[PDB]
Amino acid sequence: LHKEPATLIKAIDGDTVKLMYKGQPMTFRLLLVDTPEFNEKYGPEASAFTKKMVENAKKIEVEFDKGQRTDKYGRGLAYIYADGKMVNEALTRQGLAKVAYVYKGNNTHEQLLRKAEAQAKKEKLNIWS
Ligand SMILES: Cc1cn([C@H]2C[C@H](OP(=O)(O)O)[C@@H](COP(=O)(O)O)O2)c(=O)[nH]c1=O
Ligand SMILES: [Ca+2]
Secondary structure, eight states, rough: OOOOEEEEEOOOSSEEEEEEEEEEEEEETTEEEEOOTSTTTTTTHHHHHHHHHHHHOEEEEOOOOOOOSBOOOEEEEEEEEEETEEEHHHHTTTTSSEOOOOOOTBBBBHHHHHHHHHHHHTTTOOOOO
């Protein structure tokens, strides 16, 4: 797995972000996580968490897994990194996201995220309170 560059176009919600990638606008859906929708509980907190994380980043990178790069809705599927810190993992650690939509082929960082979730649960953080 390798990181490629990309620029914020726009925050969208907890687990989606508009990025410019290879000079094209594209909606990215975070691999292996599920944030609440904005209208659900901790949804706005999730949205704000991701928003602030990508918005304050000097360097946004995109990392595809070995499997599918696009979903059935045309959204990019990637791990997203904000100055070297993975958004997917950071949401999970803070209990603003659950591990989810784990498909074999696109699962390189599963254990790492389950590790993060386990620690969020332990602290009964946000969603787990
Ligand atoms: C995270 C992820 C979601 N999806 C699809 C499956 C879900 O389909 P359905 O709409 O058929 O339930 C949908 C969930 O995304 P959201 O949580 O953004 O809705 O996005 C993938 O296909 N691959 C993935 O890696
Ligand atoms: Ca969601």
